Amino acid sequence: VTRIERIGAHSHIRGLGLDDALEPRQASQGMVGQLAARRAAGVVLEMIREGKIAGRAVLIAGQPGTGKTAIAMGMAQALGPDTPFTAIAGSEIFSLEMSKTEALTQAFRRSIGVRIKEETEIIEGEVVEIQIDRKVGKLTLKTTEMETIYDLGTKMIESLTKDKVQAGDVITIDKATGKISKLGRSFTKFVQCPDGELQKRKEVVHTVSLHEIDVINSRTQGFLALFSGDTGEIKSEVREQINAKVAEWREEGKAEIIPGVLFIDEVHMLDIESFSFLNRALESDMAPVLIMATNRGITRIRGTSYQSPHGIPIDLLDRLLIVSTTPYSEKDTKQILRIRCEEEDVEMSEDAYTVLTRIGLETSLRYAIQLITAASLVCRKRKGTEVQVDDIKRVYSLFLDESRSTQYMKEYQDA
């Protein structure tokens, strides 16, 4: 019923609502207004899909809450799967097991995919009989269209003796390695037998990132990325030769790289040492086209008393493109609230919509989006069906906001 993923803060966003010529619609695919910044997002998405001019940075500026993250989520959705879209917060680089610069270059590598094609042959049928003559034997597999015998060699007999697989089990046998996998006991876990041919060649493609390759080629069974046991790979010894070997895979017909996308949220958390590394990491061939956002203006840079836009030094500020987002009006706010209500199961009245739009233009946009569900549930408390203005007023009274909670501080608390 309820999956691990539920209705979050960016579920309505299904992608960029652009036309064939990168012209944003008034409201489409869950994106309201934001024409200029949305079309700029479209341009960057197109030049990413192109994947020729690498090493480009963009900064989505604007007032707090002006869909700066919505644009990034829409770009991610439009880019679709099969293309790495790495999203991390500016605070995630501050790690104790690895240095901030190492974490940053690690995220960079994670934001670059490598496309490799395989031509393995996979078997898929059901076991009829398994034999063992203490050693050699025979194996009879069955599918809905045919049955056949198989000579159980050393590897096969050993693997099938180690595994508990027996007669009457739909299984798969990768003739390359011999990995046995049972998808269900029998006819009705139980599951029916497969159809078509028993042994058939299957093409497999893996979009492994340079990070995965490095972790695979660093230690004995070095695939410890699952828990990031590694504190940092050996730069220029196991990290530069992997690049040369990937270039060898390319321009030969072995593999092709897939330019990913990086989205560092709240970049103002990055210190001066992280910005210094970006000034040179974005000048290499294998560098993704990253985007970033910051709600602060000319604030202090973490590390010194210097004041600079976005809290980012000038040396990096003159190295990226800024994308400012304008404030929303009544129309845009109301349409965003309506799309948010459509995402959920709530259905507000027209007067309720106007009241919520006024409340969201008074204090802030996110406050109305939050009060949506509160009023929806308060309506269900009085045994109603539609969220009326009275419910929104009751909620506005119950739940306070930033600006109204700050003004209520006429009683001194701790400090």
Binding site: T140, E145, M146, E147, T148, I149, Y150, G196, E197, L198, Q199
Partner: protein, 105 residues
């Protein structure tokens, strides 16, 4: 059901024998109307040492090719009835309808 291994070996032997029947492979009628004996002349008193008995090559080192019995293509499968290999489901059907526990070729 399933056939035994004696039947398959007899089929193989009889097919190899037909592969050397030169007069007429299926129906040697073609009209009925110093007379030495057959190969029995020496096959009845097979000698030892260098001779057609010891002159045999023997089993090869290269494993047998798994080739289909119907179309002559690679056959990763093997029919349960007589062991005759087949390539695809179409091959298995064309076999079962032409060769099975009831028929040989």
């Amino acid at each position: 059901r399933v056939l035994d291994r004696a039947a398959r070996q007899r089929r193989i032997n009889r097919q190899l024998e037909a592969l050397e029947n030169d007069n007429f492979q299926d129906d040697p009628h073609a009209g009925l109307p110093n007379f030495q004996a057959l190969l029995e002349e020496q096959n009845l008193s097979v000698a030892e040492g260098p001779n057609y008995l010891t002159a045999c090559a023997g089993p090869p080192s290269r494993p047998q090719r798994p080739f289909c019995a119907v179309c002559g293509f690679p056959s990763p499968y093997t029919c349960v009835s007589c062991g005759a290999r087949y390539c695809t489901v179409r091959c298995l059907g064309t076999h079962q309808e032409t060769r099975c526990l009831k028929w040989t070729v």
